[PDB]
Amino acid sequence: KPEPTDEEWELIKTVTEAHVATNAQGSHWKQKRKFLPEDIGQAVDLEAFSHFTKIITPAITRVVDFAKKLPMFCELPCEDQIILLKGCCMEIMSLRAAVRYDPESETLTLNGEMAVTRGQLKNGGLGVVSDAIFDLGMSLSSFNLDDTEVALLQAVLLMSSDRPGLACVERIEKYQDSFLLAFEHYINYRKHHVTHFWPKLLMKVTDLRMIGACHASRFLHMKVECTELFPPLFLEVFED
């Protein structure tokens, strides 16, 4: 029922714009994409691990940019900005890949260019997380999300008040509740033909947050396997 207020319509546009400006190859991702050769990532695999280390940095960096284009993120202490980014990075990157799931070739596109299979992402170091991301990919196609809806989810993941060690807990929560509200209102406006769109979308926050945690455990097992190999931003963000 309730559609978005004037103030929320502007937040919607601020968060929509931060996403489209930091999303690799914007609209052209379908035309830019180049399938990873099937000989890379069969059955740890160091040749596939190398393709993935090449795009990990730019992907972390695009999330940093997305947050910086959000005024409320910029009103925060730099020590909170760091915790928030370190919490959502793998989440936002897993949603960006998953919304570029192609059921025709069953591939996710990473960095707006590299199409990969379940197995390549799995054997290239991400192990069982690949299955989680691919599965959210399969699941999120039914919902036909637009950029605005992908952005509001990112903002909800980013504005997580429960991040270990953060100081402005109450204000981050206020910021997340603002986003959640505009989001619900925008789903109403967008008149989707799915009863209970809103709640079913929100629970995808669960999926993403598990992918976050599941990745933080895989990083302990990427360290008993493949450290001079991991790019420098990857080690900052995914360690403490």
Binding site: V64, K68, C78, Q81, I82, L85, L233, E236, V237
Partner: peptide, 12 residues
């Protein structure tokens, strides 16, 4: 630790 992120966050 958070040097690159502090660079990325203070940039532009």
């Amino acid at each position: 630790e958070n040097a690159l992120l502090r660079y990325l966050l203070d940039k532009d």
